[PDB]
Ligand binder design. Structure first.
Ligand code: THR
Length: 321
């Protein structure tokens, strides 16, 4: 019997946060906003609670949970060997970045870190998350709030679709600012590795880390709607695809809305952050509409659209080069 409690994103009612914190203490799972996507969270020091997360999501035990912290002091407790990167961290945290470090903490059980010697750590730039973590008094382990294979929840409607009646409490602070999961950068190797593109853009990371490695899986793509997804990187074949795949809805930019019959305008090329903010909602809207095929325009592999394309690639049933 799920409670949905709305809070202001800037100055949330601390009485609501206290209630969430009490649930966390009881080893319960809750859902809460961040600046990236909604999180489904539990006490990071509680094995049995974090196991519930994997179950609710239907997630493989080998995929570790990101551990959310509110301070640099907490970092010192849970990770080691990051001291050379402190300048970097202080430039991007709090913020839409997860970093991989060597695990130090004894309190975070294997289940959270998937038995790995590393820990994924994020300090979220969202007052609700920060205040919740601080008030609760432990780090929170939290992947995105969605059934695995479905698009990451960027608002409470999506969370309800996936989890109503499955968790005691959802904190609603509206649509998430970015709409996309945090950039993940691994810093435990000779050269830093990008494991997931996000709001901290590749171009910016390459400025700070000239030797940044971008593995094949990142460039070549999980996040999927319930109807076959056709991603069209070559927009010359757009004409051909529409006819090939007949029973269709389109997701397209503002600047080409007029070129289609039934089309969700995800956002404009002029403000690509709009596209990122809305892409997952668009996937969820499109699946509900009464069409057999979801057809999505591809975007530049640059800036935030890099991350968008990464997500669309991992979701597509067919890509059209
Ligand atoms: C919940 C949210 O913080 C997510 N784990 C991310 O890294 O974007």
């Amino acid at each position: 019997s799920t409670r949905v409690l709305k809070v202001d994103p800037l100055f949330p009612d601390e009485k609501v946060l206290k209630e969430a914190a009490e649930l966390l203490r009881n080893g319960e799972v809750i859902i809460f906003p961040t600046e990236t996507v909604y999180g489904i969270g539990a006490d990071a020091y509680n094995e049995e609670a974090c196991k519930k997360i994997f179950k609710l999501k239907e997630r493989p035990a080998d995929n570790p949970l990101i551990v959310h912290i509110h301070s640099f002091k907490q970092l010192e407790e849970i990770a080691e060997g990051y001291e050379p990167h402190l300048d970097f961290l202080k430039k991007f945290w709090p913020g839409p970045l997860t970093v991989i470090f060597r695990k130090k903490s004894e309190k975070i059980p294997p289940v959270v870190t998937a038995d790995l010697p590393t820990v994924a750590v994020r300090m979220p730039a969202h007052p609700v998350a920060l205040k919740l973590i601080e008030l609760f008094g432990h780090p929170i382990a939290a992947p995105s709030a969605n059934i695995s294979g479905r698009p990451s929840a960027t608002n409470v409607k999506h969370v309800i679709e996936d989890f109503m009646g499955k968790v005691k409490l959802i904190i609603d602070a509206g649509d998430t600012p970015f709409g996309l999961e945090s950039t993940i950068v691994d810093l435990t190797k000779e050269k830093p590795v990008l494991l997931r593109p996000g709001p901290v853009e590749v171009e910016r990371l390459k400025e700070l880390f000239p030797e940044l490695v971008v593995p094949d899986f990142v460039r070549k793509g999980h996040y999927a709607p319930l109807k076959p997804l056709i991603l069209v990187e070559d927009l010359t074949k757009m004409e051909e695809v529409l006819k090939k795949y007949p029973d269709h809805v389109v997701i397209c930019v503002e600047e080409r809305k007029e070129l289609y019959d039934d089309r969700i305008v995800v956002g404009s090329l002029k403000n690509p952050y709009s596209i990122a903010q809305n892409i997952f909602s668009a996937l969820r809207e499109a699946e509900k509409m009464g069409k057999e095929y979801i057809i999505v325009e591809g975007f530049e592999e640059r800036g935030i659209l890099f991350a968008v394309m990464n997500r669309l690639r991992k979701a597509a049933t067919e890509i059209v080069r």
